[PDB]
Amino acid sequence: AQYEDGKQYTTLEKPVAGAPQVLEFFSFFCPHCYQFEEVLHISDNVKKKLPEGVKMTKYHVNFMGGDLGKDLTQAWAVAMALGVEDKVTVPLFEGVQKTQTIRSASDIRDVFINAGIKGEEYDAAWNSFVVKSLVAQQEKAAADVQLRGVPAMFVNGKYQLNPQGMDTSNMDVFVQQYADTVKYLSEK
Numbered sequence: 001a002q003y004e005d006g007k008q009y010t011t012l013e014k015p016v017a018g019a020p021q022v023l024e025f026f027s028f029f030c031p032h033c034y035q036f037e038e039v040l041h042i043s044d045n046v047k048k049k050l051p052e053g054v055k056m057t058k059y060h061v062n063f064m065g066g067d068l069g070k071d072l073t074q075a076w077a078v079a080m081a082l083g084v085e086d087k088v089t090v091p092l093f094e095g096v097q098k099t100q101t102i103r104s105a106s107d108i109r110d111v112f113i114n115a116g117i118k119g120e121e122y123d124a125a126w127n128s129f130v131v132k133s134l135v136a137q138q139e140k141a142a143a144d145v146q147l148r149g150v151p152a153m154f155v156n157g158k159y160q161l162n163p164q165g166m167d168t169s170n171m172d173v174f175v176q177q178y179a180d181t182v183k184y185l186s187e188k
């Protein structure tokens, strides 16, 4: 067929009940994730093609970058809680991988301050149990699929995107193939 299990996607042998409809994982340490988000704009182009009533969830992971990797999962929880993902995603990626100016939790915080989140607001969120809960939700979702690599995207707890089964000669074509595959999977 045009879409084939093992080609554009794979099928989880242990399906996850109650999983987010479309679930993306990344790390700000992850070089391919930098490409996915900053250059390919995968999340945006996937979202722009999702059926009505299909929501997209994006979570950070701990298994890259040690201590700072865990700090970034907590900062991503702050970003989600405050709803400022679209303000901090670029400077966090660039801070970690382009300028390499993010070396500590304080450096992460500076990115939010520069993006206009007030210091008191950031610190209250950082220390909040709402954010602890969001951190737990990120960890649980990744654990549910035994996640050991990023970038990764899952659909309905059942299917995992397989971008290695896609032509990478043209960036634009690759992105819409990925997006069309997520749409196809969500409609299964």
Ligand SMILES: O=C1CC=CN1Cc1cccc(-c2ccsc2)c1
Pocket (backbone or CB within 6 Å): 032, 035, 036, 039, 040, 163, 164, 167, 168, 169, 170, 171, 172, 174, 175
């Ligand atoms: O996910 C995959 C599979 C193979 C490579 N990658 C990562 C990547 C990074 C940056 C650009 C491309 C790309 C896609 C079409 S033209 C250039 C692909």
